[PDB]
């Protein structure tokens, strides 16, 4: 299948196995910003679901297609390929939603659907927006999509701004600098210094900060999950240039991301920005692996540039230099091995 | 081979992807008990190695094998599966030590050796002593071992007791009461309480805690690392009968394990007791999914069961009794999915 060939099986493999326990749920769902801004979305726009057929997405306990189903949806398929579907079934009959919700076990890459839908839901969004590739699944699902069929979420927003924060930079460094030592135990281990460097700098940081740190205003990339196709996720080149309005050292950037539940009757956003109460998602930097100084006014221009791997996550690539002294940083992250400051 | 007959693909793919991290070796090396007294045990017993061939099985980043080194080795056959090897022999080649250590890269059951050893080192101890079941890969490799020949650790002895600890216990069903609600965002969850509270106790907890919460002396189960086959790894019974010191409700059994180097000059212990300052191990409790009261002077006996399965891991039995009564409990556990309480 289309999820098969892009997927290591090994990565597939733990990658559902997680989904598969009720722990993991009861995290995402005692997230009161994602559950309720999910449940507002749905509800205010009860006039997208009376007496629609809707596909979920990756349905995990059924939670969206309850939501669905007390806006009034005439029928629901609940797409799941982890266990989780067996559960998601037990709630469905103790619920008496049996006529309006069927639980389909499987990957939504894989199953037959026995028609189609007026409008997707899903909970596609990994850290950065982009983890764990699940954008690529929902956007696939659009197979099952009647045409001016909508989509809940139906944009996503990444937003990136560079932000200075030294003691987060020191910390990484000195993690790495344990790899310095000509005599540890007797033993010499500064050959490594660098790759332990590289390794400790390619982590993305999940964690929150204070608005502060941030050294210009925001880049917004727009991904419109309407007009987006599969493939476009393959590869994401996200330019910017930041007009920089604090001088100081700038060690890395910050990453968020909102999408936005356009229905016919309102706009309902969810954001992780972090002027905004926090949620699972919390945000992310990619650190420099050196400091680039700027001046207030100077222009930081360049690349971040998303490439899919099989293990479900993107090698990340950025690129970026002060226009005005041409100082230049460029760093490689791996999307898949973040350290979890928080 | 041997290893692929017993690990499923998926679960060697992580594993060997997990060690092959630097932060991981760091971890591991910052741990001054384990480090310190591998290295005293090598030193302080240089004559079971001094112009000696020695195997390092699953070497890391070749630490044990600079031990051996330091203490004279002739020649050290230094083991590694993972990407580690990589780093291991830049570490031989800064150490200016490519006369003595060779790296091999491979699985100990896969490789070729030129020659026989007359000590094997390693460290195979996982949480609980048997998680990850390298010790079979280490007495796997005794078929290189000279008739009389050492292994470093030479014996281990997994201590379990029973314990109370009525917070721990009831975290639980705190935990697992999420799904006890009729109207979660108007759903009624209630139907999935049980699937979660199964689920929790499933998971063995991984942290460590006041000795005052043992009710009785540890028993101990050694296993032999000169005379145990691999294959006596595969089921692990271990009868106990505990003489209750204290009187209470026993929640279930702690685990933790010590490791001796039984060399010529002298016999070195690595413990991860409660009583001895606390190494990456921790300890290991398993919950009774009933507590059981005794009496001071009652008599707690029963089996604890490992059956190791294709996830590097084991599936763990516990039955119990307080002979006195015949108030008996029992769990099912996966040692694969501990619960890293901290
Ligand atoms: N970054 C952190 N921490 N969290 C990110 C949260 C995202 C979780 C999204 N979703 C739960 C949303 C749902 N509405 C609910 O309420 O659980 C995950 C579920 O989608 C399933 N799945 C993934 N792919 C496919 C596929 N191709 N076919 C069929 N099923 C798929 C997972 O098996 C999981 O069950
Ligand atoms: N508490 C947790 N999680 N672990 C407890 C610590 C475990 C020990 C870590 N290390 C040894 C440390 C080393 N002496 C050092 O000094 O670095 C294990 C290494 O054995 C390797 N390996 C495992 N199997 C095999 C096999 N069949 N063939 C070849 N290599 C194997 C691992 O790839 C890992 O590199």
Same mark, same amino acid.
């Given at each position: ?51 629609? !057929? ?64 007026? !409008? ?90 204070? !608005? ?131």
């Amino acid at each position: 299948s289309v999820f098969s060939e892009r997927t290591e099986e090994s990565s597939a493999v733990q990658y559902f196995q997680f989904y598969g326990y009720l722990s993991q749920q009861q995290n995402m769902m005692q997230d009161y910003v994602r559950t309720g801004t999910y449940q507002r979305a749905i509800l205010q726009n009860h006039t997208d679901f009376k007496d629609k !057929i809707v596909l979920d997405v990756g349905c995990g306990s059924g939670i969206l297609s309850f939501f669905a189903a007390q806006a009034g949806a005439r029928k629901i398929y609940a797409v799941e390929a982890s266990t989780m579907a067996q559960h998601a079934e037990v709630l469905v009959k103790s619920n008496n939603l049996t006529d309006r919700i069927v639980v389909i076990p499987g990957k939504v890459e894989e199953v037959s659907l026995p028609e189609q839908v007026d !409008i997707i839901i899903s909970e596609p969004m990994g850290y950065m927006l982009f983890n764990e590739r699940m954008l690529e699944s929902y956007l696939h699902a659009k197979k099952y999509l009647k045409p001016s069929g909508n989509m809940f979420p139906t944009i996503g927003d990444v937003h990136l701004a560079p932000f200075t924060d030294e003691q987060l930079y020191m910390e990484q460094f000195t993690k790495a600098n344990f790899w310095y030592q000509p005599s540890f135990h007797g033993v010499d281990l500064s050959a490594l210094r660098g790759a332990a460097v590289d390794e400790y700098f390619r982590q993305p940081v999940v964690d929150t900060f204070d !608005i502060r740190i941030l050294m210009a205003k925001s880049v917004k990339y727009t991904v419109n999950f309407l007009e987006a196709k599969e493939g476009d996720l393959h590869r994401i080149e996200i330019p910017f240039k930041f007009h920089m309005l604090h001088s100081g050292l700038v060690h890395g950037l910050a990453f968020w991301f909102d999408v936005a539940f356009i229905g016919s009757i309102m706009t309902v956003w969810l954001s992780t920005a972090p002027t905004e109460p926090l949620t699972h998602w919390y945000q992310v930097r990619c650190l420099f692996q050196s400091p680039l100084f700027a001046k207030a006014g100077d222009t930081l221009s360049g690349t971040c540039l998303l490439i899919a791997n099989k293990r479900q996550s993107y090698d990340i690539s950025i690129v970026a230099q002060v226009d005005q002294t041409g100082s230049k940083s460029s760093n490689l992250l791996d999307l898949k091995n973040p350290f979890f400051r928080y």
